[PDB]
């Protein structure tokens, strides 16, 4: 179903592998140095690969995502962790490859309130949150959403590198362009109106944690930007329409998603970049075993402009403090 594909040749994958040796800082404990090294080393990547990533980053008429195949094979991978607190992905060779590609596109960033501000988060199924609307769910379908729909500091891109796949775990992608193509002129105009409130994801709450922007935000529109290249903010589960027509238009978006969404089953060596302004994403049900061989993705976030979050970070810091989300 996915169209926007970059297939690395054996020679390009070998170059990536060699260029990763230039990235030596600890991804977790020296995140800024690690990301800055990746940004500099990315100049040594194959020009064909860099051109495709810069074109995708510019964004104009991009498909809302880019699937990269042919990354260097995942060797001596540790068992899939049963929880996300181990940050196992952040010390694998796959994370330096992911950093190099990410830093072509934009600046890597992390959030104190999302997976403890780890540079790379382990996206692994949770036994506890299996039936939850989170990255660690599995027994229920992860509903269509913009990453951090509630936050003005939300990432510009979501980066997912596959360490272990699950054949039943499908990633669903649906662009703002695909949505607008199914709607009437009236629905598009209403989606551009500030008719939906949104709340801070439960997972972002903590004892003594107050957000500068509160728990409930908005009303905001779902659609914005250029008529021919619209931006989307959506959260099926969290956004609430202010009126009866606003609740129905949210249902219209959901139906268009089920009818038009594209799917892809992430496999080892693959990497998916999602344009968080141009597309929404979801994930199918799958049945994890919690035996060390479960689906395991390395998630990271990208912003075009690191200055937008400077008020929320420390000097030479890559982590957005919780209260600013
Ligand atoms: N209801 C929205 C859930 C969205 C999900 O991607 C969340 N940001 C997570 O990683 O747990
Ligand atoms: Fe997500």
Q: Are 69 and 272 in contact (CB under 8 A)?
A: no
92 lines ligand 1 (CB under 6 A): no
Q: Are 313 and 321 in contact (CB under 8 A)?
A: yes
- Give the C-alpha separation, 225 to 293, whole Å: 42
List the structure tokens of 299.
Answer: 């998630």
Nearest CA to ligand 1 atom 4: 134
Distance 87 CA to ligand 1 centre (A): 18
CA distances (Å), 207 to each of 113, 189, 203, in order? 12, 40, 12
Strand partners, 17: none
Residue 305 buriedness (CB in 10 A; 0-12 / 13-18 / 19+): exposed
> Which of 116, 84, 107 minimizes the C-alpha distance to 34?
107
The sign of the CA dihedral 222, 161, 55, 58 is positive
Distance 155 CA to ligand 2 centre (A): 11
Q: Are 194 and 241 in contact (CB under 8 A)?
A: no
Q: Taking the CB of residue 79, how many other CB atoms lie within 10 A of it?
A: 13
133 lines ligand 1 (CB under 6 A): yes
| Structural domain total, the chain | 1
Residue labelled with tokens 């551009």: 192
Distance 144 CA to ligand 1 centre (A): 10
Resolution (Å) of this entry: 2.0
235 lines ligand 1 (CB under 6 A): yes
203 lines ligand 1 (CB under 6 A): yes
Instruction: Identify how the structure was determined.
Output: X-ray
Distance 158 CA to ligand 2 centre (A): 8
List the structure tokens of 225.
Answer: 């930007």
109 lines ligand 1 (CB under 6 A): no
187 lines ligand 1 (CB under 6 A): no
| Binding-site residues for Fe cation | 145, 147, 281
Largest CA distance in the chain: 57
| Binding-site residues | 145, 147, 281, 295
> What is the domain extent for residue 9?
1-325
């Amino acid at each position: 179903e996915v169209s926007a594909i970059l297939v690395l040749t054996s020679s390009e994958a070998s170059t990536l592998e060699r260029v990763a040796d230039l990235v030596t800082a600890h991804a977790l404990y020296a995140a800024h140095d690690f990301c800055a090294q990746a940004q500099l080393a990315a100049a040594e990547l194959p020009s064909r690969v860099v051109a495709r990533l810069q074109e995708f980053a510019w964004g104009d008429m991009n498909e809302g995502h880019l699937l990269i195949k042919g990354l260097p094979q995942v060797r001596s991978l540790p068992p899939t962790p049963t929880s996300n607190v181990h940050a196992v992905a952040a010390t694998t060779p796959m994370s330096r490859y992911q950093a190099l590609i990410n830093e072509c596109v934009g600046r890597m960033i992390a959030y104190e309130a999302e997976g403890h501000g780890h540079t790379f988060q382990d996206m692994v199924p949770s036994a506890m949150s299996a039936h939850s609307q989170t990255s660690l769910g599995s027994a229920v379908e992860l509903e269509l959403h913009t990453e951090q729909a509630f936050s003005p500091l939300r990432p510009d891109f979501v980066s997912l590198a596959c360490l272990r796949g699950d054949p039943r775990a499908l990633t669903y992608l649906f662009s703002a362009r695909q949505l607008v193509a199914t709607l009437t002129t009236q629905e598009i105009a209403m989606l551009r109106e500030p008719m939906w409130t949104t709340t801070v994801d439960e997972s972002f709450l903590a004892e003594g944690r107050t957000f500068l922007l509160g728990f409930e935000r908005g009303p905001i529109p779902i659609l914005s930007g250029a008529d021919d290249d619209p931006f989307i903010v959506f959260d099926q589960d969290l956004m609430r329409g202010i009126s009866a027509p606003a609740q129905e238009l949210q249902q219209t978006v959901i139906r268009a998603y089920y009818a038009e969404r594209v799917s892809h089953c992430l496999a080892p060596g693959e990497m998916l970049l999602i344009d968080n302004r141009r597309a929404v994403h979801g994930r199918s049900i799958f049945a994890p075993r919690f035996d060390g061989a479960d689906r395991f993705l390395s998630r990271s976030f990208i912003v075009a402009d690191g200055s937008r979050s400077r008020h929320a970070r420390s000097s030479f810091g890559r982590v957005v403090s919780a209260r600013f989300s």
